[PDB]
């Protein structure tokens, strides 16, 4: 089975490429509670179909570039920017906590 | 090499008759006769109430010294029994009673444990027709423990089997006295043994 | 001292010269053929491209190009010629390529 993931597009800004953010849930190995990690995958979008906020399935593929080993399978759900703004706000908080 | 030295001195320190001497632990000379107090300069002094450890220690020695075994083989035997299914207590005993050297004694081929040890070590003992010169060898149930016909004319063997005419044998043993054969029928039970030892004290010695 | 696996190094250098030279001719004819395609001369480019192909598949017979390495060059060659021949096309010889 080629691994299939489902995440949300957070970056339009490349050519023929979208950044998909894929959340994950699991119990902590020692302390047990359900914890929530999330990793960004660089997915291949040859037709520039998919846009910001689109929740898409992502599928393990033959390497397209560096950092690119997945293609966009299909659009599960379109246009939820709430997920994007959660990630935007977070990235924006990093401008404090320096000096 | 196991403990080699005075013995009817250990009869004394345990406060119980130890039959390692063979005969004369029966005759009124065992020194458990008219000297039941422990050896040394402070033997006749009033003993102090023993520590909870002191009790458990003297009880294992009571058992180990009876079978004439080094702590090494003794401890290995015990750790073996705590793994096998069944009561760690009794199983331990059945393993010491399965030692060939002890079996030879129990069968009355030799007077003492120590003498039975020398008879095995010197090849006078047959197991199922073959010679076995290892005292630690474990006897299985059903095996025939006989006297090698090379030594069947030896006066020490005819001596011990002379006194064995009509004497009864353990309910887990049986022997033919003329052909000098003998059989290990089954493992002995806790009840089968009259040993003056509380095993639960020995299990508790190794808990620490 | 003086192990006679030195003989292996001796032969190494002979094979070096054989392989080296075969490939030099491959490259020199391919560029010659592509040049003529770029210059519109259809017959001459084909007549040369055939020798390049023959030279390629011949180098695969030995241990020079043995693999699909031969097909790469053949594929890339025929592609470039037919495309470069898309400038007043008229593929005269038509020998190498397909109808």
């Amino acid at each position: 089975p080629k691994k299939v993931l489902t995440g949300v597009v957070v970056s339009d800004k490349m050519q023929k490429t979208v950044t998909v953010l894929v959340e994950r849930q699991f119990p902590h190995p020692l302390y047990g509670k359900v914890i929530k990690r999330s990793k960004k995958y660089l997915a291949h979008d040859p037709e520039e179909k998919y846009k910001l906020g689109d929740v898409v399935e992502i599928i393990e593929s033959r390497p397209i570039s560096k950092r690119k080993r997945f293609r966009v399978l299909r659009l599960v759900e379109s246009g939820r920017m709430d997920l994007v703004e959660k990630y935007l706000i977070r990235r924006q908080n990093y401008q404090s906590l320096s000096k | 090499g196991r403990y080699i030295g005075p013995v009817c001195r250990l009869c004394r320190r345990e406060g119980v008759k130890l039959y390692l001497k063979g005969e004369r632990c029966y005759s009124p000379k065992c020194a458990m006769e008219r000297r039941p107090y422990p050896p040394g300069q402070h033997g006749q002094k009033r003993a102090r109430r023993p520590s909870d450890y002191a009790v458990r220690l003297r009880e294992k020695q009571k058992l180990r010294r009876i079978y004439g075994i080094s702590e090494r083989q003794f401890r290995n035997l015990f750790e073996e029994a705590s793994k096998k299914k069944g009561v760690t207590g009794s199983v331990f005993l059945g393993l010491l009673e399965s030692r060939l050297d002890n079996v030879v004694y129990r069968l009355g081929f030799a007077v003492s444990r120590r003498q039975a040890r020398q008879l095995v070590r010197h090849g006078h003992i047959t197991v199922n027709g073959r010679r076995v010169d290892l005292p630690s060898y474990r006897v299985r149930p059903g095996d025939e423990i006989a006297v090698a016909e090379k030594s069947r004319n030896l006066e020490l063997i005819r001596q011990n089997l002379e006194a064995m005419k009509g004497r009864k044998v353990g309910p887990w043993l049986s022997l033919d006295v003329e052909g000098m054969k003998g059989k290990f029928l089954r493992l002995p039970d806790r009840e089968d043994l009259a040993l003056p030892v509380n095993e639960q004290l020995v299990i508790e010695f190794y808990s620490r | 001292r003086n192990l006679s696996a030195l003989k292996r190094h001796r032969q190494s250098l002979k094979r070096r010269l054989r392989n080296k030279a075969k490939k030099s001719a491959i490259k020199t004819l391919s560029k010659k053929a592509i040049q003529l395609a770029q210059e519109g001369k259809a017959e001459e480019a084909l007549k040369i491209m055939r020798k390049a192909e023959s030279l390629i598949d011949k180098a695969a017979k030995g241990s020079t190009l043995h693999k699909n390495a031969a097909a790469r060059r053949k594929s890339r060659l025929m592609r470039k010629v037919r495309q470069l021949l898309e400038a007043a096309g008229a593929p005269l010889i038509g020998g190498g390529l397909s109808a």
Binding site: Y31, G32, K33, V34 | - | -
Partner: protein, 138 residues
Amino acid sequence: MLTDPIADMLTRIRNATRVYKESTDVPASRFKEEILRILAREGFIKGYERVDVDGKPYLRVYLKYGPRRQGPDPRPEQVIHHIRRISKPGRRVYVGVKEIPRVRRGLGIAILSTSKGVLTDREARKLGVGGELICEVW
């Protein structure tokens, strides 16, 4: 807002038994009602019944206790000696069917919520399913 309604209910019962209340109200929820059913079946409470209190539904829980005891401190033995929430919010506890515990060497229960419903441990092992471990009761 209430934080963990189940532990809240378990505690309402816990605190009420230590002063030997006859009854105690807990805010009404179906899931809570399914816990109360297992306890009522298992003999830890006389039982429960729905009831309104100022318009809003509640659940009266009718506790039970032992016989009055002999000299000093006549207060009876408890039927519920120990009630303890296990899988709380902020650390959730699920067990497979082989990971289901033996509570007080069989003399207690462990109320499991399973895909086949809220079951005691015995019922769940017999049904052959695991799930979220709600509490020990013994």
